[PDB]
Symmetry: C3
Amino acid sequence: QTELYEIKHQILQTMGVLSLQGSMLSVGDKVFSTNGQSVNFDTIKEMCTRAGGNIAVPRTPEENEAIASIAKKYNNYVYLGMIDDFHYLDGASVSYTNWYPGEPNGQGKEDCVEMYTDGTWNDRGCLQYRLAVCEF
Amino acid sequence: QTELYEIKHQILQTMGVLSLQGSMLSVGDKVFSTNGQSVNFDTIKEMCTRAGGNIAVPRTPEENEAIASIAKKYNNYVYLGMIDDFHYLDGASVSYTNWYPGEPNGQGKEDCVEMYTDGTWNDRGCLQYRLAVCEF
Amino acid sequence: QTELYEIKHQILQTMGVLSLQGSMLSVGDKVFSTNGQSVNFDTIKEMCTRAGGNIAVPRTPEENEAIASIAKKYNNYVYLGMIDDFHYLDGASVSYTNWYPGEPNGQGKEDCVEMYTDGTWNDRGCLQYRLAVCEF
Ligand SMILES: O[C@H]1[C@H](O)[C@@H](O)[C@H](O)[C@@H](O)[C@H]1O
Ligand SMILES: O[C@H]1[C@H](O)[C@@H](O)[C@H](O)[C@@H](O)[C@H]1O
Ligand SMILES: O[C@H]1[C@H](O)[C@@H](O)[C@H](O)[C@@H](O)[C@H]1O
Ligand SMILES: [Ca+2]
Ligand SMILES: [Ca+2]
Ligand SMILES: [Ca+2]
Ligand SMILES: [Ca+2]
Ligand SMILES: [Ca+2]
Ligand SMILES: [Ca+2]
Ligand SMILES: [Cl-]
Ligand SMILES: [Cl-]
Ligand SMILES: [Cl-]
């Protein structure tokens, strides 16, 4: 009983501190974070995996708003965890989308997806330097 | 048994890291933190709430010293969680006080309380930009 | 059951965020961290203790690589938790070593141990300013 309450309180304290610092954003069960570095898609995947997480992907409008707020705050385009019928990296077809008007427009050439600072998406090649955002 | 020990150890590790980084200060059951931003009283309240916490207030001399050390380290005055008979934001009358000599002196005009870098207090209007310190 | 799973997941989320931020490095049960400050040996010990940890020491090749990566990333020599037969600060004789060629060479004069950015060690006096690395 009391053991568990203190434990839960301390966890919420640490998450509160991280949230206040701008080191994380929590949406439901998901936690999004960036260290502010920009690298290509594969390198973001490697960085996220190294930390025990995955490259971020928005599966809901609230998750999209959260990642967009990161893009806007750090002022850079962001690579999302999807790959060209776009799929999540787990192999499932993407449900929620937020394409910029006219996108996706690069079938066969643009396999990745970047998010603009306004939260909309563009299919893009995977070799640009983009803000690394992970989800845990 | 062992499940709980590992969990507790990991929590203390994360708190240790945050403490070392200067991202938190722990006094008893309370954790104080700032992100170094300066905004007005209402905006600090909004920032703290957003992170799952509350604007910091010292209820003990040790808590006062902790928040003072934050004010001194970030070198800015700090708004405290009290409002003019001063009350905590939970509605209770303030017990512990540490007024600068001659304060409070602004009844009816100065509804907020700021802490100086030496840890003493002054009643002040609520519309200055002050270091945002939260408690969790 | 479910209580514990959610707790464990949240802990791993916070550790993931800290890892991504570069605020910690995890090797087995140990967590290494620096705040980037440089001070002398005693002062590092005081800083680590204050945070609830201890000055870092590598007891395995993997731990050595981890601390070396911190030295390399922050680009400074690091004081290790050992003191001249070198002993850990717990009083036990050091097992794993990684001396730079020709070291240790300062018996009676060089009581501390610093790590270079390439991960090798040198016995040194204790009064230099070195990157503070703690272990939790
Ligand atoms: O992905 C492409 C590409 O980035 C082009 O540079 C741009 O002009 C297009 O609008 C966009 O669809
Ligand atoms: O709150 C007031 C105000 O800040 C005045 O500027 C100052 O001169 C007073 O000493 C103080 O009590
Ligand atoms: O510890 C000593 C010391 O740092 C000297 O400055 C250096 O030239 C030696 O090589 C080293 O062993
Ligand atoms: Ca495409
Ligand atoms: Ca496109
Ligand atoms: Ca007043
Ligand atoms: Ca006053
Ligand atoms: Ca020696
Ligand atoms: Ca030497
Ligand atoms: Cl490209
Ligand atoms: Cl004012
Ligand atoms: Cl020295």
